[PDB]
Amino acid sequence: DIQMTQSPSSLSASVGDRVTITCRAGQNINNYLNWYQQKPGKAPKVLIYAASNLQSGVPSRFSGSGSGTDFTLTISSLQPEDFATYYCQQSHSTVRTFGQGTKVEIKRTVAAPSVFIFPPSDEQLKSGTASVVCLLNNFYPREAKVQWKVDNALQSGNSQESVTEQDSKDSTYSLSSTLTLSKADYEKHKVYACEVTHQGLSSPVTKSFNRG
Amino acid sequence: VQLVQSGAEVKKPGSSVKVSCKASGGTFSSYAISWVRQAPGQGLEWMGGFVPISLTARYAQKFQGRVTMTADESTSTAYMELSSLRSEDTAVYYCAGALPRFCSGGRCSGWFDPWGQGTLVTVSSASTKGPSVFPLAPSSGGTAALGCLVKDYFPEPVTVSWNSGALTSGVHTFPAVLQSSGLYSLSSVVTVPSSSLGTQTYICNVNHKPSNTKVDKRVEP
């Protein structure tokens, strides 16, 4: 099986800047090397086939180069809709082999999160468990800290976080912190607060509610 | 030209799964479909294809003795069967068209052009559990946020739409996280102007196909 060593495993650049990805093969694969782009959630789309030929529909900034073993996928000025994972693949031998894959991220200017807090619905409460949700909407960069406080008691180990993929148009992130308590623990305290820290905020903001 | 694959399934360790892939566009030979798997967040693995001069199947060494590929030409669909399932085989399985180009001596060196949407096969002994959907109700500027909370389901594939596909802007459905109970939970939120609270009804549509569970849970103040 033809070893296909792709580099780098991940990269990030500003919108407009030039990026390159590398694929070196075990032995001569002639020209039979193809590049695929997989945006998050979708199947891979062919991008460049036979090393250098661009499959129409794909913008001009993408470009292919190489012959023999050393191949390079160049994209000339990276755009927000290029957030994806890119794969090289050889079509020389019967047993097709892929590259490791390269995740491409976009760096942008800072953008402050909008913060929302959500109390548990009346119907979820009726089934013994209760979860509180905090939402950080459309912020860059990713690094952010959310803290939960029940009656000013700082929580730990009862929350989990999800974060979306980089948005294809504005390049921001969004984050959901879900705090789960037993219904009994929920009805024993009154004030629930979500404290979020970020680079786009002069000082932390807290969204909160009382149970009534 | 399109290829449409079967649905997400759950198989218990040691059983077998048979995925389908149907060509539904121009003229497409099902014997020209190959199969590529993508373990969760882990890159692509080629499984097998059909050699065009003998129309005999060739499989990657990892799957030989476990994989069987077939193709019905009138039906215009291609099948991939993977037996003796273990936990590593939990993955998204893609069918891709391998139309012949740059051929020599009966072997071709082309690419994979049309890809299927991919079916997600989860192997586990845990039972399929349906989700419970709860509303996340609203309460700067003039923008406000609402949402649905999809909780306590298994396996993973769950889809959420807003207003039966109408609402497409400002919606964020987060990746589902695995709770301590071994069941999945995610949230789907979307931002809206405050003006439209009451003067617009927002309804989310959750579909957890492995448990055959569609639900529409209305979110309002």
Author numbering:
A (entry chain L): 1 to 212
B (entry chain H): 2 to 52, 52A, 53 to 82, 82A, 82B, 82C, 83 to 100, 100A, ...
Copied sentences from the primary study:
Here we report the identification of new antibodies containing an HCDR3 disulfide bond motif using computational screening with the Rosetta software. The tip of the HCDR3 loop in previously characterized VH1-69-derived, HCDR3 disulfide bond motif-containing Abs forms a β-hairpin that interacts with an epitope in the front layer of E2.
Moreover, both HEPC3.1 and HEPC3.4 originated from the subject C110 sequence pool but were discovered using the bNAb HEPC3, isolated from the subject C117, as a search template, confirming that the P3SM approach can successfully identify Abs that evolved independently for binding the same epitope. As expected, in contrast to HC33.1 bNAb that bound equally well to 1a157 E2 ectodomain and 1a157 E2ecto ΔFRLY, both HEPC3.1 and HEPC3.4 failed to bind to 1a157 E2ecto ΔFRLY, suggesting that the new Abs target the AR3 antigenic site similarly to HEPC3 bNAb. Contrary to our expectations, both structures revealed a bent HCDR3 conformation like the one previously found in the AR3C, AR3A, and HC11 bNAbs, rather than an extended (straight) loop as seen in the HEPC3 mAb that was used as a template for this P3SM search. Despite previous experimental evidence supporting HCDR3 loop bent conformations as effective interaction geometries for certain HCV AR3-specific Abs (AR3C, AR3A, and HC11), the long length of the HEPC3.1 and HEPC3.4 HCDR3 loops (19 amino acids) coupled with obtaining only their apo state crystals remain the possibility that presence of the bent conformation may be a crystallographic artifact.
